[PDB]
Design a protein around this ligand. Structure first.
Ligand code: HEM
Lengths: 189, 395
């Protein structure tokens, strides 16, 4: 599927952080973004080997080394960090089905993202209000990652419920309205 | 071939001649003065003096100079490079007495009429406004520039319009009085001339005459409306006096997309050795590749046959009485200015026949391989590869 990714992209070329048409300034990839990818590979390997050779269990749950007790269960059960928030979302919706759906939407809301772009500028380099909303979105994504970890009890639950409400309202409502306001400030709208 | 006999006068001016049975003669004055001797405040002084030098001297006010040199039936020419200036005349040998005299006043007591001064300023400026049409000259004047950065060699012979507008008689007078010294001057004659008569005429008239580093670089003047692209790639030429120049000329004779010429421009212990090619944009990359391959090819494919080939083409390039007076004079003037002597064609043939394939690939390997190139492009040059790519032939 990734291979499909690369094809559907070369048809259009990569984007730049200014969000503008970079056709006037393009360079080869072999000597400029290859050695850069090699350096990034080296740094990622440094972080991976200091994760493996020095702290091999800081991200896992010790429970792993317990042969499954078909009979017994871990007093504290938690999905892994990468999905922690995902489940955090579930824990929030009271209805089981609601949780499952919201959970799915959590990932799917992204797909829905290209239809919510209401700005005349592609990137957020020149868009400060939507930058603030984006960093608030990263902030409550980190909050949802933390909540998932926390057990079921006050006030972790309320935060979870709000954090989920704020997540869906920032992605669905606040960013297109902010983009409209930003277009109004530049005398474009 | 008759030998070129050189004498030296009080002033220091040299009087070189190479008698030949042709009937006319090409008598010229060379001067070791170009844009390399200018200091960015008088960057167009030699060019603008080259314009003013035929507009009358005290002795020949107004059109007198052109008139007489016209009446006699002689052709009056002058040119300026980054290192040398030449004022030459081709006339009937019987006109030697006339000729020398006229030339004398051209290089001395030339009276620049400010009236003309203003006029030439306009001429030079306007032409320059159009000199942009000579794409090749453009490409070759940034190549010089991009490579010889922070060095006098960079400044073009013409000079920046700015200076052209901002120039005055006194400045010119300075350049004239500073870079027209008698020890830096050669009176060269080729054709039907006697050396003793020319020496007596030089004694009678003209007896009164009183760093550089190569920087790897690239300049890509992109203008996509032009139909064709001109690209020049060069490395540091050995020099004028360096012996290996000859083994490099043979290498150029081995190489010989489109208009793929090859050049070995030499200045005082420096130079540009490379290739200039004009191609449709879409092929620029490919052409670049080819050129690079050929150079390394010399490093690896100096088939003896081709070695000979190159030697032979070089053998048929040497200038001689057959080529005519001017070509020869010109060679006499440049040889006395650069080498300090006229190298005969037998010495050139000896230096050609001592060149074999092993020393050709040795001299080529020293200069092409692992040598940051100077690239100058003009036109639709987007597919022209960038430096990392160019310098990196990788093959
Ligand atoms: C299987 C996981 C994925 C792999 C291996 C992958 C790999 C790549 C690679 C190699 C590129 C070209 C390099 C680059 O653009 O920086 C790329 C571009 C891109 N990918 Fe992904 N990708 C993955 C998942 C995703 C996902 C989930 C998204 C959407 C959130 C995404 C969005 C993009 C975009 C938008 C570009 C173009 C960005 C640009 O060049 O301006 N990819 N991907």
């Amino acid at each position: 599927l990734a291979i499909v990714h690369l094809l559907f992209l070369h048809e259009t070329g990569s984007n730049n952080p200014t969000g503008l048409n970079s056709d006037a300034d393009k360079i080869p990839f072999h000597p400029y973004y290859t050695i850069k990818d090699i350096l990034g590979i080296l740094i990622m390997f440094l972080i991976l080997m200091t994760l493996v050779l020095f702290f091999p269990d800081m991200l896992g749950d010790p429970d792993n080394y317990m042969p499954a007790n078909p009979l017994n269960t871990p007093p504290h059960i938690k999905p892994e960090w990468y999905f922690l928030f995902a489940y955090a979302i579930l824990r929030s919706i009271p209805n089981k089905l609601g949780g499952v759906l919201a959970l799915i939407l959590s990932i799917l809301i992204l797909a829905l993202m290209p239809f919510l772009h209401t700005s005349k500028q592609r990137s957020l380099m020149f868009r400060p209000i939507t930058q603030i909303l984006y960093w608030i979105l990263v902030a409550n994504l980190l909050i949802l990652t933390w909540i998932g970890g926390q057990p079921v009890e006050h006030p972790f639950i309320i935060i979870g419920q709000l954090a989920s409400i704020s997540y869906f309202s920032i992605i669905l409502i606040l960013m297109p309205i902010s983009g409209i306001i930003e277009d109004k400030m530049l005398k474009l709208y | 071939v008759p030998e070129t006999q050189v004498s030296i006068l009080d002033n220091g001016l040299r009087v070189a001649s190479e008698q030949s049975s042709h009937a006319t003669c090409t008598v010229g004055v060379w001067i070791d003065a170009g844009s390399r001797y200018e200091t960015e405040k008088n960057n167009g002084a030699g060019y603008f003096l080259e314009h003013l030098a035929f507009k009358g001297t005290k002795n020949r006010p107004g059109n007198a100079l052109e008139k007489e040199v016209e009446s006699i039936g002689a052709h009056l020419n002058a040119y300026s490079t980054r290192e040398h200036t030449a004022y030459l005349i081709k006339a009937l040998s019987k006109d030697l007495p006339k000729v020398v005299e006229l030339l004398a006043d051209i290089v001395q007591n030339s009276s620049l009429e400010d009236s003309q001064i203003e006029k030439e300023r306009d001429v030079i400026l306007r032409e320059m406004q159009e000199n942009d049409a000579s794409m090749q000259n453009v490409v070759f004047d940034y190549l010089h520039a991009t490579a010889f950065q922070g060095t006098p060699l960079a400044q073009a012979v013409e000079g920046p319009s700015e200076n052209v507008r901002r120039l005055s008689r006194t400045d010119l007078t300075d350049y004239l009085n500073r870079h027209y010294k008698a020890p830096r001057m050669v009176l060269a004659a080729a054709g039907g001339v006697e050396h003793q008569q020319l020496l007596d005429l030089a004694q009678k008239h003209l007896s009164s005459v009183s760093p550089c580093r190569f920087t790897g670089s690239e300049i890509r003047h992109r203008d996509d409306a032009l139909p064709l692209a001109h690209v020049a790639i060069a490395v540091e030429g050995p020099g004028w006096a360096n012996p290996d120049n000859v083994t490099l000329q043979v290498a150029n004779a081995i190489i010989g997309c489109q208009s793929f010429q090859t050049f070995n421009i030499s200045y005082s212990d420096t130079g540009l050795l490379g290739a200039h090619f004009v191609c449709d944009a879409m092929s620029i990359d490919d052409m670049v590749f080819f050129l690079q391959g050929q150079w390394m090819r010399l490093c690896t494919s100096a088939t003896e046959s081709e070695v000979t080939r190159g030697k032979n083409i070089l053998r048929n390039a040497l200038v001689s009485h057959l080529d005519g007076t001017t070509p020869v004079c010109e060679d006499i003037g440049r040889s006395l200015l650069t080498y300090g002597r006229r190298i005969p064609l037998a010495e050139w043939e000896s230096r050609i026949q001592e060149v074999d394939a092993q020393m050709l690939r040795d001299i080529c390997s020293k200069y092409f391989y692992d040598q940051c190139p100077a690239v100058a492009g003009y036109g639709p040059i987007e597919q022209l590869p960038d430096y990392n790519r160019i310098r990196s032939g990788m093959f």
